[PDB]
Structure formats: C-alpha cells, structure tokens
Design a protein around this ligand. Structure first.
Ligand SMILES: [Hg+2]
Ligand SMILES: [Hg+2]
Ligand SMILES: [Hg+2]
Length: 139
C-alpha cells in the first residue's frame, strides 16, 4: 500500500531531450549517477524545497506519486506523479544509487535526480515498475 525507503539526496543534473532518447537514456542516467557519486556541493540552496543535495529523506511511493518526505518532521517536501517520470535507473558499477528524470513544473527544466539508498537501489526501481505497469494496465 505504501513503500518507504531511507535515502540521501545527491542532487540533480540538467538533461536534454536528446539525452533521454531511447537507446541513449541508460548511458545518460549512468553518467549522471557516476558524476554525482563522489561529488559534493556545499552551497545551501534556498530554492531547493528542503530536498536538495545531501539531505536525508524518505522516498515514498503511494497513490501513483513518488514523495520526498522530511524524516524528523515528516513534512511532505516533494510530490512527483509517477506517470510523468520520463526515465529511471540504478547505478551499474561497483549497488545503492537510484535516479529518475522528470520535468521541473516551475522551470520546465528536465532534471535527473540521484539518491543514495540504504536498501538495494533496485528495490525502488522494482516498486516503481509495479506502479508504472498498473497504470499502463488500465489502458
Ligand atoms: Hg522508510
Ligand atoms: Hg541522467
Ligand atoms: Hg509508467
């Protein structure tokens, strides 16, 4: 009914449409994950909705929505409809890095968000897949 994973935000990278083309998306996502894996930006971002880089978060799946939730406060920081997630993936290399791509509602920018997960990052991909499929099923 609800799926809830402890994760840390690693930030985002801006993507182009050309990068999200079939045949190109899995290289693009692996690159973003590799790029952010050992990166750090210590700048506090006033405009990051409290779910930006380096934040401990609950990544939750409920009601066809991916939710980012403040763990101490339980505040809903971010709600992403699963239906408009363009792309998602899991770190390929030497795993617990999860990524998804969606358009930012306010800026119209395509962004790849990466999270370091406490669980196998494939548990998140697999849960999202079950929900995507149920949504496709109703076609
Ligand atoms: Hg959790
Ligand atoms: Hg990417
Ligand atoms: Hg889907």
């Amino acid at each position: 009914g609800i799926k809830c994973f402890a994760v840390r935000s690693l930030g985002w990278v801006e993507m182009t449409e050309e990068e999200l083309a079939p045949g190109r998306s899995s290289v693009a996502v692996n690159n973003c994950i590799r790029q952010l894996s050992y990166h750090k930006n210590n700048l506090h971002d006033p405009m990051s909705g409290g779910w930006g880089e380096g934040k401990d978060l609950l990544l939750q799946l409920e009601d066809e929505t991916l939710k980012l939730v403040e763990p101490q406060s339980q505040a809903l920081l971010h709600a992403q409809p699963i239906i408009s997630i363009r792309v998602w993936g899991v770190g390929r290399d030497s795993e617990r890095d999860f990524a998804y791509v969606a358009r930012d509602k306010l800026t119209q920018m395509l962004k790849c968000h990466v999270f370091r997960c406490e669980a196998p990052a494939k548990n998140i991909a697999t849960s999202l897949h079950e929900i995507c499929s149920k949504i496709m099923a109703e076609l």
